[PDB]
Design a protein around this ligand. Structure first.
Ligand SMILES: [Zn+2]
Ligand SMILES: [Zn+2]
Lengths: 689, 542, 265
DNA sequence: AAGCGACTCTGGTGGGACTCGAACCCACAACCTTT
DNA sequence: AAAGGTTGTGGGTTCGAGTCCCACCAGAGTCGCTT
């Protein structure tokens, strides 16, 4: 099952920071590196025959200016820094001069502007339908990044800048009665004012219901700042609150969100793990949203303080077959071991079980990933071992069974600096480096990202047919396995065709028509893009037929909403009569529901024309055809594939696959089409941006 | 690709030198795949607004009006014999629109060629507001500035246009290597020939262009092909074709398409044999073309020369038959690296070891092995002998325990002494007078012997042939180049150990280069060189 | 089994020193010829990596923020090989060239009590050197040679393997008068050392029987002025650097004796 | 005067980039080369 | 008699070597001000 996928991705700069590889729900892979964040965007390319992974590459630049954590007045801090560095005590003086938090830049110190950590938001956080990237530098600049156009990442906000000012405005006191304004000239208070705002790691919540998302930032002193962002996130404008909770955990290493549901009651908390070993779930006692609620009291998952640093945390929702109820499985990397804890609400409240699955590695675990759909864990160490670790349900709680996957057999002797798993578990991505060659060191070090197939084509095909999520973009990594097979064998495997026809016959929801359209477009590319010409014409005819079907279903739904809201007698933003004419144009499709709907509409429609005009002419556009409109002067305007209005604006939206086009919403548009314009592309479910 | 993006892409496929407005329309009209719009005057205003409203596009006035573009189409794409020839058919090499003037060491990191980069002025804020609203129509802009209006895409857009979506933006290139890539980009589907880049674009040594092209091959930004130039001589020249990956198309060749037909013919003929005449007649080919195809098929190893009697095909008839070191050192804890490297070199002993072979044996970087060799030479514990093998004058290193007794030493010392003898024996139609290693001294000595024993020698070929046989008797696998000899003969000329005399003689309507070499004791007026000229002219006579 | 491990070097990590003044910090050097300073709270990136020549041992003297480094000579420029003090980076001083050495310095030891450093060479010479107060910029140290002296040099005197060397040579140990450093730069051991530095050529046709492999100052306040060293000969030699022992050391030894004798009886 | 801490002034080497010298290769015309 | 494999040519390709030259280094010198 595990075999390499063809393109290795070369990295220009050293891999950098904590747990440096991640794979977003949006199929963008980020590697945090000394001079950038490289982002690898996986495209199920339907326009080319190449069997490789089509990886579009972008990067976030490293900052040009080093970040100073604000601890006082610009002069007050300067005299303090002189005092400590000049101190004749070896301890005070060397503690100041060695710790890079106090010294983010210097005369002979390398600048720490590369990236410490990165976290991907859920989808829908961006101004487009996409996810945001939270990025942390090693000089503690925490920033939120988005790729609004395709080409260039822009910083939306710097959260360290805001939080520094908000601490300064409260004299670094969280409760104003609780502490003095301690003198900055005391090294303990000086260190504290740095420690209280040095971010360790951060994680996004799920989407809270108007949408909202939280971001929890963990600080070295055990404070956590819970940011609340309004969605879509557009900058400082969307920051609805910041609230700091004092965890009290000493030397906190890692953070993750716990979110859980039982009896449709929502609950949530923050799980936090110390570098000194223990793991605890905090109740998030403060939040503004009304639909969620929070855990009542902290629960201790591991108490031992054995100083095995909790390097990573992941958790997955599960349904336990024998307890016959939903439960949450937590897995945490602790040194070379995996700690696991299963959390199960019952009539007793929380029932909790835990263990260490042991003997996995002879070196500490350098990265960990959870297969969200199964709880399959992967774990990795710099000796190049990767171990697949399968949760098996037990009459109470779990057992874990595990196996090594031989990267030696696919890449040879290799070092692995990180792993990530695709959102459906289709691929494992690995940061490979030159390994020890028969006990010799490699002379030259070159980081790469490499991919291996975790699933067979037959399992990817089956899981797409039985897909509960029923959106192709949620499953680009599975349809890429299907794509690879079709391009490799230049035919659609018969069992997939037969099963898909059975689904289209027995269910026929537009997801299966979208899946058919994908297979046929990849088939067309496979056969070199006159029996071959006859076959090309045949399957292109089939593509056009199913492409036409998906169009009718969308047009029917649009008119099936024009009929429901107040009649737009001015015909303001939809070519209603043109669409009615287009639907009535043939008797070939018998669907009475459309034919009566256009009856009711055409009864209600105004006798005034309200035609669409070509802006270069102020002459009518007839609405002859799906894709584009033309006028007597010969201008050609594309039509918005969501609303069929002509995209005459100098900027308009394009699908991720460029298979489809959409208009930008305007203030003249009613709310209901401003919502309609947020639909994914009707042909490929990709963001239309 | 979308029409609006195809506009901005075309603006970004010119380099930092950018476009004039009439050049832009010419680029859109010549685009492949075809530009979707009819490009009417109203459309040109719409596209002009699409430029002005785009924040990455920027506009300049240059000090002088730019020339308009030629018809760029490089290739013939026709033949009168079977098939067609897509060899380069040369347009007039008019004054280049985009002469190379590299923007070196730029502090903002923007790169490319622009002859006016320091001299042109920004007029963005004249053409648009800072709110990106267009201030001028296209007709107003072209009326006000004409060809002096220059459109340039941002560096981020320009570099993207060179690497495509799969390319990595983090990759910095040297300015010279970027300007090669940029020079490819503006050529679109018809890449520049490497010959032409060094000859007339960059005006550099072919070694310089190759060297700077290496990084583009290493990162894989460009694709390499052999390509064919049909000269007005009627003869046709080999040269490399460089295509930026976006624009790669596998170019065919007349001999390639015709050899496929012969390969198909012979492979479908169940004997895999046919006579040359029928192989010609089935393709209508002349013998002059076909004999290339025959010898290509032979040199490709696909077929074998065969002859059969006509009664065997059913008089002997010509036919074609188709048919198709040093061990690694374990570093010890207990000795320094200089000691351990010397221990290696003593183990090799009389044969020595090279710096590159030390590096692989010691598992060290290139700069690290270099310092090991430098120090051991300076300590006088190891001695370095040059050795020519392959294309490379390497050094082999031998410890002073063995260095004197080494074959490299003994052979070098013999040829040094032999050279000292051969030098010290020196005496105290229109001719023109021209301006260490063991094998190099052997070649020098052999020439000095020849001019000592034969005070004239009639051509550089005669020098080469004896040298080639002499080295072949020694068993040398490499074959001595003409340029190596003529550069060697130049060295002896500057040492004054010979004269080389060159001219072209003319006879019976044909011309011959003479390239006489003579002992320094005679000048071009000597009856011997005159006799040589006459006897060359005799044998050149009809 | 360990609680923490991290990949400090891309090649064998030959030497560690752990910071005394604050044990959150550690330094390591490896045969990638980098010196890397670490913050053990934050092991993912070093505080400072300085690429240098290949190094054999490090010493971190308590009062000074930087580290003094002993080099293997195989990559140093001829005449610039030796021993360097290197600031960890905040003060930003250039490396201070405390002593030129021709051979590789195999081993190094900093006396915290003396603030001096001692170093053993394949030349078979043991030197000591006094560092300046490295809170102050070393570039003002206009003549560092006044701050170093030899302890001894071993010479082979005629008389690739041990028996063939031992049968035909003996070790002449030449010892300095460490009783005082008067007229130091005119005394023959300094001239002998100064004619060694820069000009002398390393010998590779022998076992290196004279080479010194370890050097250690006493960490104890009692005997603080004593040094031990040993090498390829398997001889081990002890020296008292009488000139650096001092009344404050006696003053402190007696007061510490009194306090100790009061605490334990 | 004798002394000090910047501020220079002077010979020497390496780091990466790059000139260098060589063989190797095209395709043609010359014709030596063969039944 | 009656003709083709065999070869030399002008120019481009290319391959790994040693070379370049600037910045940096270690030492010695200068001298405004102090002691
Ligand atoms: Zn029109
Ligand atoms: Zn689409």
């Amino acid at each position: 099952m595990v075999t390499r996928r063809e393109p290795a991705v070369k990295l220009q700069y050293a891999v950098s920071g904590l747990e440096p590889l991640a794979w977003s729900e949006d199929h963008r892979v980020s590697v945090s590196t000394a001079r950038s964040i490289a982002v690898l965007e996986l495209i199920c390319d339907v326009h080319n025959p190449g069997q490789d992974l089509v990886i579009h590459r972008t990067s976030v630049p490293a900052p040009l200016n080093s970040c100073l954590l604000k601890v006082g007045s610009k002069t007050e801090v300067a005299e303090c820094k002189e005092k400590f560095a000049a101190s004749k005590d070896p301890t005070v003086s060397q503690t100041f001069m060695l710790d890079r938090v106090f010294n983010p830049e210097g005369k002979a110190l390398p600048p720490m502007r590369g990236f410490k950590y990165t976290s991907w938001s859920p989808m829908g956080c961006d101004a487009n339908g996409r996810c945001l990237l939270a990025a942390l530098t090693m000089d503690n600049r925490l920033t939120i990044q988005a790729n609004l156009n395709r080409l260039q990442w822009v910083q939306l906000v710097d959260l360290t800048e805001i939080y520094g000012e908000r601490l300064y405005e409260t004299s670094y006191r969280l409760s104003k009665n609780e502490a003095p304004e301690g003198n900055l000239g005391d090294f303990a208070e000086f260190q504290r004012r740095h420690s209280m705002q040095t971010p360790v790691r951060m994680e996004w919540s799920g989407i809270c219901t108007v949408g909202s998302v939280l971001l929890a930032v963990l600080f070295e002193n055990g404070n956590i700042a819970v940011w609340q962002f309004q969605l879509p996130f557009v900058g400082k404008e969307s920051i609805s609150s910041c609230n700091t909770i004092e965890s009290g955990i000493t030397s906190p290493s890692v953070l993750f969100w716990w979110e859980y549901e039982h009896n449709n009651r929502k609950m949530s908390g923050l799980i936090v793990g110390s570098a000194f070993g223990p793991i605890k779930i905090l109740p998030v006692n403060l939040k503004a949203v009304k639909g969620y609620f929070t855990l009542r009291q902290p629960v201790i998952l591991w108490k031992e303080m054995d100083q095995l640093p909790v390097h990573s945390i992941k958790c997955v929702p599960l349904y336990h077959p024998y307890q016959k109820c939903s439960c949450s499985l937590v897995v945490a990397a602790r040194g070379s071991y995996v700690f696991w804890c299963l959390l199960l609400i019952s009539k007793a409240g929380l029932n909790v079980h835990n263990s260490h699955v042991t003997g996995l590695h002879s070196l500490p675990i350098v990265s960990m990933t959870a297969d969200k759909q199964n709880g399959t864990v992967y774990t990795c160490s710099s000796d190049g071992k990767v171990r697949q670790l399968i949760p098996i349900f037990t009459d109470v709680a779990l057992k874990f069974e595990h196996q090594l996957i031989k990267l030696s057999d696919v890449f040879g002797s290799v070092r692995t600096h990180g792993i990530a798993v695709s959102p459906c578990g289709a691929y494992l991505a690995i940061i490979t480096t030159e390994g020890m060659i028969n006990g010799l060191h490699p002379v030259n070090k070159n980081y790469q990202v490499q991919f291996v197939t975790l699933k067979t084509f037959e399992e990817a095909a089956a899981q797409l047919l039985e897909s509960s999520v029923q959106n192709l973009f949620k499953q680009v990594d599975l349809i890429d396995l299907v794509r690879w097979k079709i391009l490799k064998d230049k035919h659609i495997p018969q069992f997939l065709q037969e099963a898909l026809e059975k689904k289209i016959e027995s269910s026929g929801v537009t997801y299966f028509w979208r899946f058919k359209l994908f297979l046929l477009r990849i088939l067309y590319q496979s056969m070199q893009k006159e029996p071959m010409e006859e076959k090309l014409l045949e399957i292109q005819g089939k593509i056009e037929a199913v492409e036409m079907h998906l169009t009718r279903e969308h047009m029917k739904r649009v008119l099936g909403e024009v009929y429901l809201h107040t009649w737009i007698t001015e015909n303001t933003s939809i070519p209603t009569r043109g669409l009615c004419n287009f639907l009535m144009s043939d008797e070939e499709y018998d669907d009475r529901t459309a034919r009566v709907l256009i009856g009711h509409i055409s009864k209600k429609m105004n006798k005034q024309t309200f035609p669409e005009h070509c802006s270069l002419c102020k002459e009518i556009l007839p609405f002859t055809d799906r894709k584009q409109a033309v006028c007597s002067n010969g201008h050609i305007w594309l039509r918005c594939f969501l609303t069929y209005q002509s995209c005459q604006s100098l900027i308009y939206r394009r699908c991720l696959l460029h298979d489809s086009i959409a208009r930008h919403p305007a203030p003249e548009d009613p709310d209901w089409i401003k919502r309609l314009l947020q639909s994914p592309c009707p042909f490929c479910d990709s963001p239309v941006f | 690709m979308d029409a609006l993006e195809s506009l901005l892409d075309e603006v970004a496929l010119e380099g930092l030198d950018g476009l004039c407005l009439p050049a832009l329309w010419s680029r859109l009209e010549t685009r492949v795949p075809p530009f979707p719009l009819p490009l009417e005057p109203c459309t040109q205003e719409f596209l002009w607004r699409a430029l002005a409203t785009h924040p990455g596009i920027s506009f300049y006035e240059e000090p002088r009006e730019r020339p308009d573009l030629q018809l760029q189409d490089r290739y013939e794409e026709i033949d009168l014999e079977t098939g067609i020839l897509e060899s380069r058919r040369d347009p007039v090499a008019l004054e280049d629109v985009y002469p190379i003037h590299m923007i070196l060491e730029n502090k903002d990191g923007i790169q490319g060629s622009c002859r006016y980069f320091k001299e042109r002025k920004n007029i963005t804020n004249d053409i648009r507001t800072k709110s990106l609203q267009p201030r001028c129509t296209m007709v107003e802009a072209f009326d006000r500035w004409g060809k002096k209006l220059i459109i340039v895409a941002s560096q981020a857009m320009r570099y993207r246009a060179l690497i495509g979506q799969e390319g990595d933006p983090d990759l910095k290139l040297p300015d010279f290597s970027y300007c090669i890539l940029e020079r490819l980009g503006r050529s679109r589907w018809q890449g520049e020939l490497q010959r032409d880049l060094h000859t007339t674009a960059f005006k550099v040594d072919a070694g310089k262009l190759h060297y700077h092209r290496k990084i583009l091959n290493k990162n894989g930004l460009i694709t390499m092909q052999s390509h064919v130039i049909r000269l007005p001589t009627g003869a046709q020249q080999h040269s490399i074709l460089l295509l930026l990956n976006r624009f790669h198309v596998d170019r065919r060749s007349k001999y390639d398409i015709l050899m496929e037909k012969l390969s198909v013919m012979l492979s479908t003929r169940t004997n895999h044999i046919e006579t040359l005449g029928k192989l010609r007649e089935e393709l209508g080919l002349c013998e002059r073309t076909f004999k290339r195809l025959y010898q290509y098929m032979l040199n490709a190893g696909l077929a074998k020369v065969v002859s059969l009697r006509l009664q065997e095909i059913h008089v002997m008839v010509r036919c074609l038959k188709l048919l198709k070191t040093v061990p690694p050192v374990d570093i010890v804890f207990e000795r320094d690296m200089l000691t351990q490297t010397y221990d290696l070199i003593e183990r090799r002993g009389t044969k020595g070891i090279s710096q590159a072979e030390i590096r692989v044996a010691m598992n060290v970087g290139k700069l690290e092995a270099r310092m090991l060799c430098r120090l051991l030479q300076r300590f006088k514990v190891v001695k370095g002998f040059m050795e020519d093998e392959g294309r490379q004058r390497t050094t082999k290193y031998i410890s002073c325990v063995f260095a004197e007794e080494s074959d490299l030493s003994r052979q070098y010392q013999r040829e040094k002494a032999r050279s000292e003898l051969l030098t010290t024996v020196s005496l105290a139609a229109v001719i023109e007078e021209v301006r260490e290693t063991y094998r190099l001294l052997k070649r020098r000595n052999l020439i000095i012997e020849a001019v000592t024993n034969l005070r004239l020698i009639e051509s550089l070929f005669t020098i080469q042939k004896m040298i080639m046989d002499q080295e072949k008797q020694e068993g040398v696998s490499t074959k001595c180049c003409k340029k190596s000899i003529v550069r060697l003969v130049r060295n002896l000329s500057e040492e004054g150990l010979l004269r080389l005399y060159r001219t072209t003689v003319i006879q019976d309507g044909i011309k011959k280069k003479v390239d006489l070499v003579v002992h320094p004791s005679m000048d071009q007026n000597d009856p011997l060189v005159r006799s040589a000229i006459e006897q060359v002219r005799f044998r050149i006579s009809n | 089994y360990p609680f923490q491990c991290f990949l400090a070097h891309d090649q064998a990590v030959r030497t560690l020193q752990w910071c005394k003044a604050n044990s959150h910090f550690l330094v390591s050097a490896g045969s990638d010829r980098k010196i890397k300073f670490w913050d053990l709270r934050r092991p993912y990136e070093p505080i400072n990596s300085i690429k240098r020549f290949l190094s054999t041992e490090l010493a971190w003297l308590l009062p000074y923020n930087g580290v003094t480094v002993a080099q293997d000579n195989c990559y140093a420029s001829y005449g610039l090989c030796g021993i360097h003090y290197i600031d960890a980076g905040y003060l930003g001083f250039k490396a201070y060239f405390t002593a030129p050495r021709k051979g590789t310095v195999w081993s190094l030891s900093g006396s915290d009590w003396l603030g001096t450093i001692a170093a053993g060479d394949i030349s078979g010479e043991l030197i000591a050197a006094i560092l300046p107060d490295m809170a102050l910029n070393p570039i003002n140290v206009k003549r560092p040679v006044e701050r170093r002296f030899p302890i001894y040099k071993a010479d082979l005197i005629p008389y690739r393997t041990y028996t063939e060397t031992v049968n035909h040579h003996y070790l002449l140990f030449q010892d300095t008068d460490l009783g005082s450093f008067h007229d130091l730069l005119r005394r023959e051991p300094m001239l002998r050392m100064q004619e060694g530095e820069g000009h002398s050529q390393l010998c590779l046709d022998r076992l290196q029987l004279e080479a010194i492999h370890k050097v250690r100052f006493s960490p104890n306040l009692d005997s603080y002025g004593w040094l031990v060293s040993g090498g390829q000969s398997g001889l081990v030699r002890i020296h008292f650097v009488r000139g650096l022992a001092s009344p404050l050391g006696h003053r402190m030894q007696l007061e510490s004796r009194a306090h100790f004798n009061a605490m334990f009886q």
